[PDB]
Amino acid sequence: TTKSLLSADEKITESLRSTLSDVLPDQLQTYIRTVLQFSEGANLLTGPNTEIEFFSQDPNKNFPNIFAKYSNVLTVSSDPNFITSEDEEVKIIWGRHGSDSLIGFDPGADLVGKRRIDIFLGDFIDEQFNPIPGALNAGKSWSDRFILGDWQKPYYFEDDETLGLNQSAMILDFNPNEDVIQLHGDRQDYELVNISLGTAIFWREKKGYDLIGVLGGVSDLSLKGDYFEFKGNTAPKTVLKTAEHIGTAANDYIFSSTVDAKGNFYVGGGTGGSLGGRNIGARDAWLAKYDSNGNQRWSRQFGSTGTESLWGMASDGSNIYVAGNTTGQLENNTVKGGNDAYLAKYDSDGNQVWIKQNGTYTLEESYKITVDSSGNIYTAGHTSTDGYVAKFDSNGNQLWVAQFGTITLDDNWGVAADNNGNVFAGGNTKGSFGAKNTGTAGEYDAWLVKLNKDGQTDWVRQFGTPNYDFMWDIETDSLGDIYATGWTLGDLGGKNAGSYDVWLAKYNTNGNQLWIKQFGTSEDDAPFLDGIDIDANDNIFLTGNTNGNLGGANAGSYDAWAAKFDKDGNQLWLKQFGTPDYDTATTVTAVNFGKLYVSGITEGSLGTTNAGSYDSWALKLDADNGEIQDFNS
Ligand SMILES: [Ca+2]
Ligand SMILES: [Ca+2]
Ligand SMILES: [Ca+2]
Ligand SMILES: [Ca+2]
Ligand SMILES: [Ca+2]
Ligand SMILES: [Ca+2]
Ligand SMILES: [Ca+2]
Ligand SMILES: [Ca+2]
Ligand SMILES: [Ca+2]
Ligand SMILES: [Ca+2]
Ligand SMILES: [Ca+2]
Ligand SMILES: [Cl-]
Ligand SMILES: [Mg+2]
Ligand SMILES: [Mg+2]
């Protein structure tokens, strides 16, 4: 009846207004009210109008620090939400450019009775906010996928006698001509309701209704549309039974890998579940050790009630150093800043020997670590954002920190030591750091820096197209030359095949650019995270994702790929592997006896049946030809 639909509208409005107004800080409420006033839904946010601050001496009172706590801001790439964590009641998940795979909910977390609203911006690209005209990417949009369930269960589902308004998605830029909403089960399990805000997606069974999502500003949709993807209620069929499978009912990620001098292989990343130990809260960091024959020796999980990940790991040959960021307190003499870099040392028996956290209110991210042949440790990251490199000794004493960059945004996506006391860093900049940027609207270029043993700058170099270029990872070869891998939307190493393409750049120790190779399909091709490794014979290995037919026929959605190059940039092989669902590689580690490990993440069943949402996997390849071996061979 009319009065049932009117009651639903009222109860949805009142519930969202209550949750949003109680959870979002006043400064964020004020910004969102002003946008909505330009474009009535300002009435969901009842907080007082508050001056928005950028120049407080207290980083915490500044809009960027407040915004960071309630946001996942992804990249110009086609991203999975690799920073998802159940640490806030309300979160803004912002895909930016690229065909993003957006999740905010962890179906393996204990969320009983908790309020959860995830606000999704599929695109909302930088150029929509930037008033300068004629940007290359002005008015561009991508096919985003909003994940509101999987094969296991619907997300935001309270399964109770209420309308289920305590947990819901809110998607603000859904375009039914382009985007996809992913749901548990099949279309007969849902009802769409026209509401003031746009469209309500209700789960419906005999027992009752539960609000799963609200689609802002869109009406008169159908559950028969191509823009709804239904996952059913059974785990996908297992492929690649040769892989090592790592998964809980929660979101589980491998982000990095390494090897020790005995051939033991290590993996690590973040989990929303109890993977290496009992979950401490939200996402935790984890790592695991395998012997040279594929046998798991131990797993460790550490963290806070906040969010942390292992983003990088490296070995001095016996110990394993791990790095990342935390929103909590990992070191018990540290005053946490809520967004801090950490470094820790594990022994080969899985004892956390020490941990160091940079407790400052300054926002800090750190994705990269390396160890030199003297056993000193280098981390890199960013804190406008500026890059840094930090050097530590094996007892975790800081030897120096180098900070550098431009007046605009610089990020770090690489650190690598040579044999000779020098360290390289690399990353992305909107500015003119080592060259004048050809982008007319602050599109990223790639940069490289060489620091000496004292942390002084030997040189800076910059390369790019006028479009976005994005570096993900760097590594040195045995001669001390520096290699970088990334994606480009332009013609960097050659004519762009379409959309994102892969590049591999080499510089010598003196800063001369030797070559840039580019390869790809007409579709999206990119390395990702820990995307380059170089073995003792100076063979280069690259890894990432593609939604094209890059190494082979595409299995479905994005797949993983791996490639081998020689030190002159000749392609020796390129292999593609995956499931019918979303997959990406995240890391590659060469070992010896011609063995290579590629590891990553998946929404499908890779190695064994999917345990829930994201699972992880590790694949052993033959380095001669890319052929997949049994992990246990
Ligand atoms: Ca993106
Ligand atoms: Ca997007
Ligand atoms: Ca989109
Ligand atoms: Ca709900
Ligand atoms: Ca945690
Ligand atoms: Ca901090
Ligand atoms: Ca800067
Ligand atoms: Ca560029
Ligand atoms: Ca391409
Ligand atoms: Ca796939
Ligand atoms: Ca999982
Ligand atoms: Cl970015
Ligand atoms: Mg955040
Ligand atoms: Mg690497």
Residue numbers in the entry: 7 to 45, 49 to 392, 413 to 662
Question: What do the authors say?
Answer:
The cyanobacterial enzyme CylK assembles the cylindrocyclophane natural products by performing two unusual alkylation reactions, forming new carbon–carbon bonds between aromatic rings and secondary alkyl halide substrates. Two molecules of 1 are then dimerized by an alkyl chloride-utilizing enzyme, CylK, via the formation of two new carbon–carbon (C–C) bonds to construct a paracyclophane ring system. The structure reveals an unprecedented fusion of two protein folds, an N-terminal Ca2+-binding domain and a C-terminal β-propeller domain. We identified the active site of CylK at the interface of its N- and C-terminal domains.
CylK crystallized in the C2221 space group with a single monomer in the asymmetric unit. Phase information was obtained by partial substitution of native Ca2+-binding sites in CylK with Tb3+, followed by collection of X-ray diffraction datasets at the Tb X-ray absorption peak energy. The structure of CylK was solved to 1.68 Å resolution via a combined MR and single-wavelength anomalous diffraction (SAD) approach, with the MR search model generated from a poly-alanine seven-bladed β-propeller. The modified β-roll structure in CylK contains three vertically aligned Ca2+ ions on one side of the core fold. Also, the loops that connect subsequent blades contain unique blade-bridging Ca2+-binding sites, suggesting a shared role for this divalent metal in structural stabilization of both domains of CylK. Cavity 1 is lined by the top face of the β-propeller domain and the N-terminal domain, forming a solvent-accessible tunnel that is ~18 Å deep and 15 Å wide at its largest point. Although 3 was required for CylK crystallization, we could not model the alkyl resorcinol substrate in the resulting structure. Notably, the apo CylK model also contained a positive Fo−Fc electron density peak at the Br1 site. Given the presence of chloride salts in the protein storage buffer, we modeled this site as a chloride ion in the apo model. However, the closest Ca2+ ion is approximately 8 Å from this pocket.
